[PDB]
Each structure stands twice: as C-alpha cells, then as structure tokens.
Chains A and B, each alone.
Chain A
Amino acid sequence: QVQLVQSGAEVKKPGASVTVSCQVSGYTLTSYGLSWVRQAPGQGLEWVGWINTYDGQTKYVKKFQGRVTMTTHTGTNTAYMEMKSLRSDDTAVYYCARVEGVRGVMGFHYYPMDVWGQGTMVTVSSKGPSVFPLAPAALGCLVKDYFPEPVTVSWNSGALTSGVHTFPAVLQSSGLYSLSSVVTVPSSSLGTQTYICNVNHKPSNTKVDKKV
C-alpha cells in the first residue's frame, strides 16, 4: 500500500506563514517527485508546485514564486511546503500528490499524480455570516458575506427537516460566500407564527439565530 498522510488543519492570520507536511508510507520518498495542488473551497483544483526529491530542484507557478518553499526531509520520508505572507485568498485544501519522474525529466511533464494525500484545510481569514430574513407560502434565511465555506443552517434544530432546502454557497466578487435556506410553510401558519433559523460557522466561531 502506498499512502500519503498530511498534517492537521491549520488556522492562521493574514501575513503569517504556514507549513504543511506530507508523510509518505509504503515507498521511498526519493523514488518519486511530489506535486502540491491547492483547491479553494468550491473553486476546482489549482496546481501549486513540484518538488523533485533526490535532487531538490523545484518548480512553482509564477503566481506563487518566492512566497512558497518546498523541502524534503529524507530521514523521516517527509516533505514540507511552507507559504509565507499568507493572504485571505489562500484559504484552501492542500494536497500532496505523487509523480513518477525524478531523474532525467521533470515528472509532471509526462506523468500523472497517481496517489493523493487527504489534504489539509489551511484557512487564513475570519468573517461573520450576516443573516437576513426573507418573507413575502414560504420563508427563508439569507446568509451573506462569510469567507470559509463550512456553514450549517437549521431551524430550531429539531423543528424543520422537511421542506427546507440548503442551497450550496455561491461566490462573490468580494471573495465572500453566501447562501440561502428557504422552507415552505402552510398559508395559515405564516401569519400565526414564525420560525427561527440557526446559522453556525465554525471557522468564524459564530452561532447566530434569527426569526423569519
């Protein structure tokens, strides 16, 4: 079995530096080059760089030149990618992937990334999810302007499970996520009583409940 085990999730502050480690197992690290691929939450994969173990020559994207450094600790079969001068846009999952060619050629030109690590969620931001009501049938809660994606919305945590719809978050030119959760209500029940929606945002550590 060939396995790549990555570090734990990191929570940082803008302008700081983070170090993600990738521990290989089941093969010798110097036999394969190691590519690093990021994925902003819901933005598709983006190639970050490539470390050639056994000779240490690197190759990064121009977007990351200077602010990303990849090294290989051969003693522990570990590989480190450190990012300095973190920004808010760098919040993403990072994967280390195994590439074949180290000697003679740059591997990623001709070979795929056959084995991937589980990836670490490096989140450099914090933003509270602003909550707005949506009333006119149906009624909903609009969550707006929160950077890290994982956010859950319930209704009294035990009241509504049927008729509720959780639209996946959507981007914004400001780089902030927003979604909505609307539930149908009987026309009689809308004027008699209203419900309260609970929005939980672990990376921002924000738990806000709002009615209608």
Chain B
Amino acid sequence: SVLTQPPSVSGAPGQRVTISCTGSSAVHWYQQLPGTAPKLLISGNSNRPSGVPDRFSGSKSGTSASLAITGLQAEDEADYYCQSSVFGGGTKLTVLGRTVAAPSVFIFPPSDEQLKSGTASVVCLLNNFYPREAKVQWKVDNALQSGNSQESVTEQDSKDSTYSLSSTLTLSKADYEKHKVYACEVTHQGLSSPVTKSFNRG
C-alpha cells in the first residue's frame, strides 16, 4: 500500500492549496510545523478534528484523497503527511513573496583537501533568484550530467523575499581528473537564456 503525493507546494498567504494522496488500498492528514510534533487535522477521510479551523477540507474520489487549505497563512505552512501502516512521502508548504529578480551565478572549485579525500564535489551557487521554479543543469565537458547533483534551496529571505540555491556534485578522484571543465546553467523562468560559468582545472 504505497502512498504518493505531489511535494513542495509553494504559495503566498491567502489562497488555495491542494495536496493529493493516492492510497493504493482510512487516510488521515497530519501537519508537522517546523520543530514541532505532528498534529492531526483530517480524521476519517474528510472529517476535521477538534480545534482545526474549517479552512482545511478533505475530498475523496474513488481512490485519491485531496486536502484543500483555504486562506493559508504562516501557521498553516508546514510539512503535510497522509497516513493509511504506512505514511506519505511528505509535501512542504512554503510562503512566497511577490518580487522578481535575476539569478547571480557563482562557481566554486573543490578544495585541495577535498581532492585528497577523493570525493571532488564541486558547487555552483545561484543567489537572489526568483521564482522557485528554476531548474539547474550541470555541463560536463558540454555533456549531460545526472545522478550526482544534490540541490539545496534557501527559504524566502526576510526582507529580500528571494531564493538562493546551491548544487553540489561529487565524483571519484579516479574519474574527476578526466573532465577538467564544468559549467552550471539555469533554465530560469525569469531568464530564458541560460547563464554559463565554466572553470578549467589549471
């Protein structure tokens, strides 16, 4: 009975949010605020428990349940899980600010001590980019890169209200010394043309 649901939903305060869990076999919806115990908010399949504001609602189709949050604000933004025993994958709810800017790209070569370790993980940073939807691709001697880049994005800034991402990829030293040039481009929603920044190991 695997459970699936669409992760990482981003939205500003005060609109609709829908999360869809597709049970493959009573599904209940729990909310985990950051650094707090999870809280039940949808019993049964569409019932709400005591203390839960009527903004939350549930709807069950044949085999897909959906949780709708209305007029969300800070305390309504958390991680959300569907449970049936097996839990869901989790969907994060993040606030969004309304301001547009372009990414600022930097590439940082691996450190020498990192090289002697054998895991020459190299990082590319995109600072103050908007919006959340900004896919990033690594170019390995102008070739496709996949399966090794871990990406981590900072939450909305308190005042800048933008995003910053770092993608790091690691490789064995036996094969690291074989490429010698790497690029990190963004298929930015704001910026159609990807920005290339390469570096040669010299």
Direct contact of A and B (CB under 8 A): yes
Instruction: Find out whether the CB atom of A142 lies under 8 angstroms from the CB atom of B123.
Output: yes
A180 touches which of B44, B85, B168 (Cβ 8 Å): B168
B37–A165 touching, CB < 8 Å: no
A135 at the interface (CB under 8 A from B): yes
Contacts of B106 in A (CB 8 A): 136-138, 182
Q: How far is the CB of B158 from chain A (nearest CB, A)?
A: 10
Asked if A112 contacts B111 (CB within 8 A), the reply is no
Cβ contacts under 8 Å, A117 to chain B? 37
* B40 contacts A112, C-beta separation under 8 Å: yes
A129 within 8 A of B: no
A interface, size bucket: 35 or more
CB distance from B8 to the nearest CB of A (A): 13
Q: Using A142-B123, A165-B164, A182-B166 as known contacts, say yes or no to A119 and B37 having CB atoms under 8 A apart.
A: yes
Question: Chain A residues near B44 (CB, 8 Å)?
Answer: 112
Interface string of B25-48 (1 = CB under 8 A from A): 010101010000111100110000
| A47-B85, A132-B113 as given contacts; A114 in contact with B90, CB under 8 Å | no
Q: How many angstroms between the C-alpha atoms of A179 and B152 in the bound complex?
A: 8
Determine if B154 is an interface residue (Cβ-Cβ < 8 Å): yes
Contact flags (1/0) for B110-122 with A, using CB distance below 8 Å?
1101100000010
B189 at the A interface (CB under 8 A): no
Task: Give the segment of A72-80, A166-174, A196-204 that binds chain B.
Answer: A166-174
CA distance A41 to B164 in the complex (A): 22
* Complex partner residue of A46 from B87, B152, B164, CB under 8 angstroms: B87
Asked whether, in the complex, the Cβ of A138 is within 8 Å of the Cβ of B125, the reply is: yes
User: Contact between B79 and A44 (Cβ–Cβ < 8 Å)?
Assistant: yes
**Does residue B49 face the partner (Cβ distance < 8 Å to A)?**
yes
Per-residue CB contact flags for chain A residues 15-50 toward chain B (1 = under 8 Å, else 0) read 000000000000000000000010000001111000
Asked if A135 contacts B152 (CB within 8 A), the reply is: no
* CB under 8 Å from chain A, chain B span 57-113: 79, 81, 83, 85-90, 106-108, 110-111, 113
Instruction: Say if the beta carbon of A206 comes within 8 Å of chain B.
Output: no
CB distance from B25 to the nearest CB of A (A): 11
Please indicate the chain A residues that have their CB under 8 angstroms from the CB of B123 in the complex: 134, 140, 142, 180
Residue of A nearest to B199 (CB): A136
A167–B164 CB distance below 8 A: yes
Residues of B within 8 A of A128 (CB): none
- Check B38–A95 contact: CB distance below 8 A: yes
Q: Which listed residue (A47, A112, A118, A134) contacts B37, Cβ 8 A?
A: A118
Residue contact A116 to B43, C-beta cutoff 8 Å: no
Interface residues of B (CB under 8 A from A): 26, 28, 30, 32, 37-40, 43-44, 49, 79, 81, 83, 85-90, 106-108, 110-111, 113-114, 121, 123, 125, 127, 150, 152-154, 164, 166, 168
Closest 6 CB pairs of A and B: A112-B28, A134-B108, A132-B111, A44-B90, A116-B37, A167-B152
Q: Could you list 17 further interchain pairs (A-B, Cβ under 8 angstroms) beyond the known A113-B38, A144-B114? A: A44-B87, A47-B86, A47-B87, A110-B26, A112-B44, A112-B49, A112-B83, A113-B83, A134-B108, A137-B106, A144-B121, A168-B152, A170-B168, A180-B123, A180-B125, A182-B125, A184-B127
Q: What are 14 A-B contacts with C-beta separation under 8 Å?
A: A45-B38, A47-B87, A112-B30, A114-B43, A115-B40, A116-B40, A132-B113, A133-B111, A140-B123, A140-B125, A167-B164, A178-B168, A180-B166, A182-B166
